[PDB]
Amino acid sequence: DNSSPPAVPQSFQVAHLHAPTGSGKSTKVPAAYAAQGYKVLVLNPSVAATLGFGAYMSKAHGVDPNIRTGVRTITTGSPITYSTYGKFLADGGCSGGAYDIIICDECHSTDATSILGIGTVLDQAETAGARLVVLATATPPGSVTVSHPNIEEVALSTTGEIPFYGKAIPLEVIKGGRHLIFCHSKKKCDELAAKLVALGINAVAYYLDVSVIPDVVVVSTDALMTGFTGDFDSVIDCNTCVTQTVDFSLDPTFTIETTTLPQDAVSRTQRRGRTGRGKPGIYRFVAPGERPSGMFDSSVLCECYDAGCAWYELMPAETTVRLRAYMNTPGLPVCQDHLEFWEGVFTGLTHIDAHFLSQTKQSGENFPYLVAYQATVCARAQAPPPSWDQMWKCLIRLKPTLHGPTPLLYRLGAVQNEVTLTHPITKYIMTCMSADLEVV
Amino acid sequence: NSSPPAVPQSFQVAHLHAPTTKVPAAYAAQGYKVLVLNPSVAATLGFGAYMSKAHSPITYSTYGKFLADGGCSGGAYDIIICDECHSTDATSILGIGTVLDQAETAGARLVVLATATPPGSVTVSHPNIEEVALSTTGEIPFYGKAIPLEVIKGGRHLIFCHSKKKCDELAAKLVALGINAVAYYRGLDVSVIPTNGDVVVVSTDALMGFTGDFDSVIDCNTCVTQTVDFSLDPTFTIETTTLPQDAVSRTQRRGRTGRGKPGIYRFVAPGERPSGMFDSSVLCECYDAGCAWYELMPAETTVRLRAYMNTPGLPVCQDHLEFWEGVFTGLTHIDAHFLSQTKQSGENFPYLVAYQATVCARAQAPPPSWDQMWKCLIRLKPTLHGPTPLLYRLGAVQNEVTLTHPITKYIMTCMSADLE
Numbered sequence: 092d093n094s095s096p097p098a099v100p101q102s103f104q105v106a107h108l109h110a111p112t113g114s115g116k117s118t119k120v121p122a123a124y125a126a127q128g129y130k131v132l133v134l135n136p137s138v139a140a141t142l143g144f145g146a147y148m149s150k151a152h153g154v155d156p157n158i159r160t161g162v163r164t165i166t167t168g169s170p171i172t173y174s175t176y177g178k179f180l181a182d183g184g185c186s187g188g189a190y191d192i193i194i195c196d197e198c199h200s201t202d203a204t205s206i207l208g209i210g211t212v213l214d215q216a217e218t219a220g221a222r223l224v225v226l227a228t229a230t231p232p233g234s235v236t237v238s239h240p241n242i243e244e245v246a247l248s249t250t251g252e253i254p255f256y257g258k259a260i261p262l263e264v265i266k267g268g269r270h271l272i273f274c275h276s277k278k279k280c281d282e283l284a285a286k287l288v289a290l291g292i293n294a295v296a297y298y299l300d301v302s303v304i305p306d307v308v309v310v311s312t313d314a315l316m317t318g319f320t321g322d323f324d325s326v327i328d329c330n331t332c333v334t335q336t337v338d339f340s341l342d343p344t345f346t347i348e349t350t351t352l353p354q355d356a357v358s359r360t361q362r363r364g365r366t367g368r369g370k371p372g373i374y375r376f377v378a379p380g381e382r383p384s385g386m387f388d389s390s391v392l393c394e395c396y397d398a399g400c401a402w403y404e405l406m407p408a409e410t411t412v413r414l415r416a417y418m419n420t421p422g423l424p425v426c427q428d429h430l431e432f433w434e435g436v437f438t439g440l441t442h443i444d445a446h447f448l449s450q451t452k453q454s455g456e457n458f459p460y461l462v463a464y465q466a467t468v469c470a471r472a473q474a475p476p477p478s479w480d481q482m483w484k485c486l487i488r489l490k491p492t493l494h495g496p497t498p499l500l501y502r503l504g505a506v507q508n509e510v511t512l513t514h515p516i517t518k519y520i521m522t523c524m525s526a527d528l529e530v531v
Numbered sequence: 532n533s534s535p536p537a538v539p540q541s542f543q544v545a546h547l548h549a550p551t552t553k554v555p556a557a558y559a560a561q562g563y564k565v566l567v568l569n570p571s572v573a574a575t576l577g578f579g580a581y582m583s584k585a586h587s588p589i590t591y592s593t594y595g596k597f598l599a600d601g602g603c604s605g606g607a608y609d610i611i612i613c614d615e616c617h618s619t620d621a622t623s624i625l626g627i628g629t630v631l632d633q634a635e636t637a638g639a640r641l642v643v644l645a646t647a648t649p650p651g652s653v654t655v656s657h658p659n660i661e662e663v664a665l666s667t668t669g670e671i672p673f674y675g676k677a678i679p680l681e682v683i684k685g686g687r688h689l690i691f692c693h694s695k696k697k698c699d700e701l702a703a704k705l706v707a708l709g710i711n712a713v714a715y716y717r718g719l720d721v722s723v724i725p726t727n728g729d730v731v732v733v734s735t736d737a738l739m740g741f742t743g744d745f746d747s748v749i750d751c752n753t754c755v756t757q758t759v760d761f762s763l764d765p766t767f768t769i770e771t772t773t774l775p776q777d778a779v780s781r782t783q784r785r786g787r788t789g790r791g792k793p794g795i796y797r798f799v800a801p802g803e804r805p806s807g808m809f810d811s812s813v814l815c816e817c818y819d820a821g822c823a824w825y826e827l828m829p830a831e832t833t834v835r836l837r838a839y840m841n842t843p844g845l846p847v848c849q850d851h852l853e854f855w856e857g858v859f860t861g862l863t864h865i866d867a868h869f870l871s872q873t874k875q876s877g878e879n880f881p882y883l884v885a886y887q888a889t890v891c892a893r894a895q896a897p898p899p900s901w902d903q904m905w906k907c908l909i910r911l912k913p914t915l916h917g918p919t920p921l922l923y924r925l926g927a928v929q930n931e932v933t934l935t936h937p938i939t940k941y942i943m944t945c946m947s948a949d950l951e
C-alpha cells in the first residue's frame with residue numbers, strides 16, 4: 092500500500108508500510124504520529140532494538156518513551172510506547188483505549204513470538220479502539236536482494252587456497268585485515284578457523300560471547316548480529332542457513348528437526364550488510380541465488396501454540412483465533428495451514444506437571460510445553476525420557492523410572508531408549524494427524 | 532530487464548524479464564541464427580499451430596528434444612533463447628544448464644534467459660478478474676472455509692482441489708445438493724460438459740488451456756509436489772507433499788476465468804509461496820535422466836547442473852550435486868532389460884527403479900512391493916526368496932527388508948560424507 096507513513100483514517104484500517112529501515116520506521120514514523128497528537132505503540136521482535144529506540148529518542152530528541160520489555164519496564168506517560176511482541180503478549184495484548192496506532196515493525200519476522208504477536212494485534216486492535224495498524228517492513232513477502240552502491244559483489248571461483256562450501260577463498264583477500272565469514276554451523280566454525288589459526292591468519296569463532304578487533308578474520312554463525320564493529324571491508328558468505336522444520340514422520344507422529352537450506356533474501360541482505368557501512372565494501376559468495384523471503388515452516392505454528400500454553404495462558408482455541416487473523420491478512424509471510432492440527436494436539440495435552448513446565452521454561456528449551464509434557468507422561472508411566480540429553484533434565488531421578496520402553500508422543504531430538512507407540516496421547520496425536528492434515 | 536538485449540561483441544548471458552515470436556524475430560532480421568527453447572512447442576493457448584511450424588533463421592524446439600539431440604551442435608546458432616526459464620521440471624533445468632555450459636564453446640554469442648516470472652515474482656492484480664476471499668459461511672466445506680451454494684448454483688464454475696480424491700468427494704457433495712458437478716483429473720475424458728449449460732468442474736491441475744467458460748474459479752491454493760526425505764531408513768525416500776501454491780500456480784488457476792468477459796476468483800488463502808526454489812529430488816531426477824535417456828556420465832550431468840547453479844537469476848536449490856553424482860556413480864552394472872522396461876512404462880525414476888530391480892533379481896529377492904512400478908520382475912516365482920535388499924524408498928514398502936547390501940552401505944556413506 093504505502094512507501095510513506097499512511098495518514099490516520101476515520102475508520103479502522105490495516106496499512107502496509109514498505110520502507111528502507113534507515114528512514115526511521117521505528118523512530119521517525121511514530122514521532123510523526125505523536126506530533127499529530129496520537130498515542131502510538133511500536134512493536135519489535137528484539138529486546139535490544141526496543142531499548143535501542145528508547146535511548147535514541149531520549150538522546151537525539153529528548154523524548155522519553157514508555158519502554159516495555161520482559162527484563163525492564165519504564166513508564167513516562169509519553170504518547171510513544173516501545174515494546175517487544177513478547178512483552179506485548181505477556182501484557183495480555185491490546186489494552187482497551189490505550190493506543191490509536193499500533194506499528195508492527197519488522198512484520199516480515201517469522202519467529203513464533205512475532206507471528207503470535209502480530210496475529211494478536213490484527214485480532215484485537217479494532218475492538219481495543221485503535222484506528223490504525225501499520226505492518227512495517229523493509230522486505231515484504233517475495234523480496235529479493237538488490238544491489239548496494241557501496242558494496243561490490245564478487246563470485247568466488249574454485250581457484251584458491253581455502254576450501255569453502257565447494258569453492259575457494261584466495262589467501263589474499265583474507266589478509267586485507269578486516270573480514271567476516273559466515274558458516275552454517277558451529278562445528279565448521281572451529282574447523283574453518285582452526286584451518287588457519289594453525290595457518291596463523293588469526294581467527295575466532297562465534298556462536299557464547301564477544302571477542303573481537305579494533306588484523307582479524309571472524310568466522311561465525313548467525314548468532315552474531317547486525318551491529319557491533321560495523322567496520323569490515325569484506326564479507327564472505329556460504330549462503331546457507333540452518334532452519335527448523337517439522338516432519339510428519341509417522342514414527343509414531345511428528346519430528347521437530349533441522350534442515351540446511353539456501354539462505355533467503357533477509358539472510359543474504361543482512362550478512363552482506365555488515366560491510367560497506369560508509370566505506371566501500373566487497374561481498375564474496377559461494378552461490379549467486381537465494382530463496383525469496385516470505386515463507387515459514389509449520390514447526391513455527393507448533394511453537395506459537397507451545398508459547399500460548401507455556402507463557403501467555405492461552406487455550407489453544409484462543410491462539411488459533413490470533414493466528415487465523417494472521418493467516419487471513421494479505422501481504423504477510425505464508426505457511427501451511429496447520430492451525431487445526433496444532434490446536435488439536437495441544438488441546439489433548441492435559442494435566443501437565445506444573446513443576447516440570449516451570450523447569451523447561453527456565454531452561455530455555457525451544458518447546459517447553461511439549462518437553463514438560465513428554466516428561467509428564469514418562470514420570471506417570473514410570474518410564475524413562477526418550478534420551479538423557481539435557482532437554483530431559485527435569486526428570487533426574489533415573490532410578491525409579493527406568494522401567495522400560497519410553498511412551499513416545501513425538502520426536503523433539505534424538506531418541507536413544509527403546510520406545511512404545513501405544514500411549515493414548517500418542518494415538519490421539521495420530522488421530523489428529525488423520526483428522527486435520529491433508530493427504531496426497 | 533524489460534527490453535531485448537542488443538547482441539554484444541563477446542559472449543554473455545542476458546535476462547529478459549518480459550511481461551505476459553516476440554523477440555526472436557527481431558534478432559533474426561539482423562542476420563542472426565537464433566534457437567528458442569521451451570518445455571513444449573505446442574500453442575500456448577491449447578489451440579493453434581505448433582511453434583516449430585515453418586513459413587529459416589529461427590528454430591523452435593524444446594529442452595527435451597535439445598537434450599536428446601546431445602545439446603549444442605557446432606556453430607549452428609548465434610543466439611539461444613531459453614524461454615520460461617523459471618520452469619523447475621528436470622528437463623528444463625538440465626536443458627538450461629546444458630545451454631549455459633555449451634553455448635560459448637559452440638560459438639554462440641548470446642544466451643537469453645527469458646521468463647514472465649523471475650525469482651521472487653508475486654501474483655499481480657487482473658483488471659478483468661475480481662477476487663473474493665471465502666468465508667467460513669456456506670453449505671459446502673472447502674479446505675477449512677466454505678463455499679456458499681449461491682455462488683455456484685447456476686452458471687459455470689471451476690473448482691481446483693489438490694488431489695483426485697478431494698475432487699470426487701467434493702463433486703459428490705455438490706451433486707447431492709442439486710449441482711451438476713463433474714470431477715476432472717488425469718486419466719479422464721474431457722467429458723467436462725460439451726456445452727453451455729450450468730456445470731461445476733471440480734479439477735486437479737490436469738486439464739490445461741482447455742476451452743471452458745467459467746464465470747468463476749474457486750482455488751484451494753494448495754499443490755502437491757515431489758520431495759526427497761533424507762530419512763535414514765536406510766537412505767532416502769522420494770515422497771509427495773502438499774504445499775501452498777506458488778505465484779505461477781495461482782496466476783495460472785485464476786487465469787481460467789475472466790477470459791474476455793469479467794470473472795470472479797475465490798480463494799482459501801490470500802497469499803502464495805514466492806516462486807524461485809525447487810527440491811533436491813529434481814536434481815536426483817536430472818542424473819536419473821542423464822543415465823537412462825541421454826547417455827550422460829554423472830560427471831557430465833554435474834558439469835551441466837553446476838553451470839545452472841552458477842548462473843544468477845534462476846530458481847535455487849540445495850547444493851547436492853556431489854551427493855547425487857556419488858550415488859549414481861556407485862550404481863554399476865544395471866540390468867539393461869530392466870532399464871528398457873522402466874523407461875517404457877514412464878516411471879519417474881526409471882534408472883533408480885530398474886537398479887533396485889537389478890539388485891533384487893541378483894539376490895533372487897522380491898521387490899519392496901508388487902505395485903506396478905516393480906513389474907519388470909514379474910517373472911516372480913524364483914525370486915520371492917526372502918527379504919528385500921532395500922537401497923532407498925521410491926514408494927511404500929510391503930516386503931520384509933534387509934539393510935546390508937553393499938550398495939545401501941555405499942549410499943549411506945555418500946549421505947554421511949556429502950550431506951552436511
Ligand SMILES: O=C(O)Cc1c[nH]c2ccc(Br)cc12
Nearest residue numbers: 160161162175177178181402
Ligand atoms: O523478553 C522480551 O521482552 C520478549 C519476549 C519473548 N518471549 C517472551 C515471553 C514473555 C515475556 Br514477559 C517476554 C518475552
Ligand SMILES: [Ca+2]
Nearest residue numbers: 338339340760
Ligand atoms: Ca518425511
Ligand SMILES: [Ca+2]
Nearest residue numbers: 338760761762
Ligand atoms: Ca525425515
